[PDB]
């Protein structure tokens, strides 16, 4: 028996106010008029009476979209505050125009009429409001130590965050950008960048800021989509405040703008400069032409040096031929790196400091060219973006290992004279370190070729997904390294008392890299190595067996080894499978825009004159007219976009409501004509 | 304090054209006819 009563009692109005509110809601030109006259004379009705469910007389008159009752209430001095916002949110032009011609609320007090109009994204209401000289407060910069931001955040943090989000939502509407900004493309780019960088700062309101940034990027792409000619697209892309706006969009990570089909057409025509209709030809003749131009890599580079402006000197200046020549030079470098480890060119293996062979003497200009190119990349173009590549770390590692190999070879040549057999050299002979670093640099140089996958149409998205899933490999190795450190600590602590010597063990071998694996858990480094190698099954089971008859210690060690194997394989590897499968499933939707953005970024790196020579040969010693043309193009694009959007806003629901309103008005007019 | 004005100003028609366009949009056999006669 649960008793049910209204615990929050609302003060109900008198019966005289109910008649006035019912006359307002039903709609009557005479009953409301005489009710207001009686309220003026006898004071029977409070004019500012309000329903318990947040509905004043003016709000109900707005909800009925009738202008006569609204005009009479406006002339009868009804409380008009917080009533234009309801008409704006209802999105009716006549009521907003009438209220602009002159307690409880459903809107937060920081909302202005222009802000709500921008939130609702109605073109006519926003235009009619901005004609009345309205302004929006400027949101502050993200990192503020000023008093006006810090004190406001300290006093009322929720109101501050709500006000900032409301302002940024008002500024990000496509209609307000199309009306109030003279450069909607650059405004959309900048607002998308600020909203994306601000979503990470305000990590709790991340979804709304990410949605607003996506809205701005979509508006920029849709504004570019309305181009009806190649001249308009060339004017858009070349506008400088060669392809300036495309470089700006690449800077602001506008992947949807970059991967637009007409931008990709213009980039493809600029890429195949010397080949009219490269996509037209057969794949066999394309492969033959690519092979010929690649095999002509000593050519077209000497000709550039001896005659830059000849018939043949301008052949390498085209971007595709430049890319082919660079790829051919790198493949030749890797071929000589393969040849450097062969018996035909490498002899006299028992000298402490050897002079370089012919293959290494040929390798040296390539290494100097790579070093000089990476040095020039630090200066030319800039330094703040050189580290913002994530491929230049690999190049820096390659060049550092090359420099270390050269310096160690020089030291071993100048301080070691004579010959000595290789078995009696010391552990840290400079020659051995040089041969190790050269091999590591060979691995890095041959793995550098993955960056060329974005040019191909089939290996590009594959490398994009490879990066996507390496981002989760990086997360998985933290848990794996914690588990590895835990079990290594435990196993070394259990097993370090039974450490033997290399002399006692057979073949003078102490470690897990022997025929009979010895001292697998004796030291912490060897324990880490053993627990790493047990993942691939290369650690045998008898390494947990000690010389003495300590069967309890052996059993506890084998149990630790089995628990580590279970945790590190059965749980963790299949967890990694599930993680990368989920990440691949998410990225497979947006996998072609990313590849097209990466291919575009690779294409614009070959457009400029800098770095024309391959690394073998790169070490051998009025604005008003453009602004007005861009302004006409923006005017046409904005008009086309606003027309397409304004009738794409026509909806079955709104059309149906409009038809009922027109039918009701016409029936009432006909009834008044008959009566 | 971000100022908001229409940067791409459209040449608005005269008030006489607004009456003709409103008569066309609302639907009137007589108002559009007399408007066209006055335009002639
Ligand atoms: C990423 C960016 C950085 C990349 C590396 C830049 C530096 C590169 C190379 C410089 C290496 C150090 C100098 C070697 C010669 C000097 C010397 O006497 O060394 C002593 C110490 O030698 C060592 O301890 C060996 C260090 C090998 C590092 C290999 C890194 C491979 C990275 C692979 C990554 C995949 C010789 O021994 P001793 O002390 O005489 O006894
Ligand atoms: C005594 C020690 C002995 C060691 C012996 C073994 C040596 C092993 C050497 C090889 C080590 C691993 C090398 C991995 C190379 C491939 C890296 C991933 C490539 C890939 O697909 O992702 C790219 C990132 O690569 C990158 O970010 C490149 C990372 C390069 C790291 C180099 C470290 C040295 C994406 O491309 P993108 O970066 O353009 O994506 C957009 C901007 N984020
Ligand atoms: C870190 C991430 C969270 C991990 C949470 C835990 C995961 C499960 C751990 C299971 C540990 C099992 C240890 C077994 C063991 O040491 O055996 C070797 C030892 C070797 O002596 O085995 C024994 O001593 C008992 C012999 C029977 C073993 C039965 C194993 C049943 C469970 C199998 C799981 C799938 C394989
Ligand atoms: C499977 C083994 C034998 C590979 C050995 C390494 C190289 C011989 C391969 C690996 C990556 C390959 C590259 C992968 C992608 C491309 C881009 C591709 O570009 C185009 O098709 C041109 C048109 C465009 O840019 O879209 C031309 C071949 C090339 C350089 C490939 C040339 C041959 C490379 C260097
Ligand atoms: Ca580089
Ligand atoms: Zn501030």
Swiss-Prot record, chain A:
The keyword Membrane applies. The chain crosses the membrane at residues 320-340, 361-375, 390-410, 433-453, 469-491, 560-580. Keywords: ANK repeat, Calcium, Calcium channel, Calcium transport, Cell membrane, Disease variant, Disulfide bond, Glycoprotein, Ion channel, Ion transport, Membrane, Metal-binding, Repeat, Transmembrane, Transmembrane helix, Transport, Zinc. Residues 341-360, 411-432, 492-559 are extracellular. It is a multi-pass membrane protein. Expressed in brain with higher levels in fetal brain. Found in cerebellum and occipital pole. Residues 1-281, 317-319, 376-389, 454-468 are cytoplasmic. Disulfide bonds join 509-514. Ca(2+) binds at residues 374, 377, 392, 395. Activated by G-protein coupled receptors via direct interaction with GTP-bound GNAI3, which increases the channel sensitivity to phosphatidylinositol bisphosphate. May be activated by intracellular calcium store depletion. Calcium channel activity is enhanced by MYLK, that promotes its subcellular localization at the plasma membrane. One of its GO terms (biological process) is calcium ion transport. It is found in: Cell membrane. One of its GO terms (molecular function) is ATPase binding. It is linked to Loss-of-function variants in TRPC5 may be involved in a mental disorder characterized by maladaptive behavior, anxiety, autism, postpartum depression, extreme food-seeking and hoarding behavior, hyperphagia and obesity. Belongs to the transient receptor (TC 1.A.4) family. STrpC subfamily. TRPC5 sub-subfamily. This is Short transient receptor potential channel 5. It comes from Homo sapiens (Human). The gene is TRPC5. The chain holds residues 17 to 758 of 973 of the full protein.
């Amino acid at each position: 028996r649960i008793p049910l009563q209204i615990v929050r009692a609302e003060t109900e109005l008198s019966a005289e106010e109910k008649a006035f509110l019912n006359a307002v809601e039903k709609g009557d030109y005479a009953t409301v008029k005489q009710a207001l006259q009686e309220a003026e004379i006898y004071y029977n009705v409070n004019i500012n009476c309000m329903d318990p469910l947040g509905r004043s007389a003016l709000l109900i008159a707005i909800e009925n979209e009738n202008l006569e009752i609204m005009e009479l209430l406006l002339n009868h001095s009804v409380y008009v505050g917080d009533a234009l916002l309801y008409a704006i949110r209802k999105e009716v032009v006549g009521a907003v125009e009438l209220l602009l011609s002159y307690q409880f609320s459903e809107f937060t007090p920081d909302i202005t009429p222009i802000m709500l109009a921008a939130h609702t994204n109605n073109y006519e209401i926003i235009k009619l409001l901005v004609q009345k000289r309205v302004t929006i407060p400027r949101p502050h910069q993200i990192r503020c130590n000023c008093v006006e931001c810090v004190s406001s955040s300290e006093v009322d943090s929720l109101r501050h965050s709500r006000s900032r989000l409301n302002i940024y939502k008002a500024l990000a509407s496509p209609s307000l950008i199309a009306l109030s900004s003279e450069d909607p493309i650059l405004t959309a780019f900048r607002l998308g960048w600020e909203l994306k960088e601000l979503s990470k700062v305000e990590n709790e309101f991340k979804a709304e800021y990410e949605e607003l940034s996506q809205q701005c990027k979509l508006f920029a792409k849709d504004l570019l989509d309305q181009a009806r000619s190649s001249r308009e697209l060339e004017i858009i892309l070349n506008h400088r405040d060669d392809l300036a706006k495309l470089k700006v969009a690449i800077k602001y990570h506008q992947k949807e703008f970059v991967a637009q089909p007409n931008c990709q057409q213009l980039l493809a025509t600029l890429w195949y400069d010397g080949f009219p209709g490269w996509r037209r030809k057969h794949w066999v003749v394309k492969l033959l032409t690519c092979m010929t131009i690649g095999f002509l890599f000593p050519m077209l580079s000497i000709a550039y040096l001896i005659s830059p402006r000849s018939n043949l000197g301008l052949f390498i200046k085209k971007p595709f031929i430049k890319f082919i020549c660079h790829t051919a030079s790198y493949l030749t470098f890797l071929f000589m790196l393969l040849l450097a480890s062969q018996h035909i060119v490498r002899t006299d293996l028992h000298v402490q400091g050897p002079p370089p062979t012919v293959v290494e003497w040929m390798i040296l200009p390539w290494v100097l060219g790579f070093i000089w190119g990476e040095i020039k990349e630090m200066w030319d173009g800039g330094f703040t973006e050189y580290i913002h590549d994530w491929w230049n770390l690999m190049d820096f590692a390659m060049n550092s290992l090359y420099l270390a190999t050269i310096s160690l070879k020089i030291v071993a040549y100048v301080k070691y004279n004579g010959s000595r057999p290789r078995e009696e050299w010391e552990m840290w002979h400079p020659t051995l370190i040089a041969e190790a670093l050269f091999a590591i640099s060979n691995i890095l140089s041959s793995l550098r070729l993955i960056s060329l996958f974005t040019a191909n149409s089939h290996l590009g998205p594959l490398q994009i997904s490879l990066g996507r899933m390496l981002l989760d490999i990086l997360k998985f190795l933290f848990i794996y390294c914690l588990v590895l450190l835990a079990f290594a600590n435990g196993l070394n602590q259990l097993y370090f008392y039974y450490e033997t010597r290399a002399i006692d063990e057979p073949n003078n071998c102490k470690g897990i890299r022997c025929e009979k694996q010895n001292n697998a858990f004796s030291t912490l480094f060897e324990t880490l190595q053993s627990l790493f190698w047990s993942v691939f099954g290369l650690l045998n089971l008898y390494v947990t067996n000690v010389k003495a008859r300590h069967e309890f210690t052996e059993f506890v060690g084998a149990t630790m080894f089995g628990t580590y194997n279970v945790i590190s394989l059965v749980v963790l590897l299949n967890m990694l499978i599930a993680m990368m499968n989920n990440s691949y499933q998410l990225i497979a939707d947006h996998a072609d825009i990313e590849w097209k953005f990466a291919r575009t970024k690779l294409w614009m790196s070959y457009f400029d004159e800098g770095g024309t020579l391959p690394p073998p040969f790169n070490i051998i010693p009025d604005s008003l007219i453009q602004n007005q043309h861009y302004q006409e193009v923006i005017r046409n694009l904005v008009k086309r976009y606003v027309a397409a959007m304004i009738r794409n806003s026509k909806t079955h629901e709104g059309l149906t409501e409009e038809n009922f309103k027109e039918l009701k008005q016409d029936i009432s007019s006909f009834r008044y004509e008959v009566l």
